[PDB]
């Protein structure tokens, strides 16, 4: 076992290195339950640009150092990073204009109707494929 894992990035402080957390369960014969446990694995990152909080896939590889024997193969999800410049633009748009009770409610209703209509078309296409 231990050929492949999917986990979360918890440390990117090393050069071309990363630490990934893994979850697994163990069977306890006496109490007839599965016990949840955790482990930490160090993996090699050629890109050297990982972010703490990413979901990545690591694979078994030749030993590279004392505690590094895995290589990062792919990223399944990218962690969110705060950007002040983008946030300031959004705040300006929100403060640019304001609507009344009725206008805001009518706008909300129209937006939902348009989203619902597109979803119905997609569902019909899926049924046609079936």
């Amino acid at each position: 076992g231990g050929f492949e894992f999917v986990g979360k990035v918890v440390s990117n402080r090393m050069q071309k290195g990363v630490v990934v957390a893994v979850n697994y369960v163990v069977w306890i014969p006496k109490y007839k339950v599965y016990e949840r446990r955790t482990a930490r694995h160090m993996a090699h990152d050629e890109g050297n640009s990982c972010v703490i909080g990413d979901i990545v896939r690591i694979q078994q590889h030749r030993k590279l150092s004392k505690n590094k024997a895995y290589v990062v193969v792919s990223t399944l999800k990218h962690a969110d990073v705060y950007n002040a410049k983008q946030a300031a633009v959004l705040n300006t748009e929100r403060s640019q204009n304001k609507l009344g009770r009725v206008e805001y409610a009518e706008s909300r209703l129209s937006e939902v109707q348009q989203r619902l209509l597109k979803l119905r078309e997609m569902y019909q296409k899926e049924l046609a494929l079936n």
Partner: peptide, 16 residues
């Protein structure tokens, strides 16, 4: 998803 969106639409009409 289609069912949930329909519920949202009904609430939106009530809010108006």
């Amino acid at each position: 998803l289609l069912r949930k969106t329909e519920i949202e639409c009904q609430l939106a009409m009530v809010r108006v």
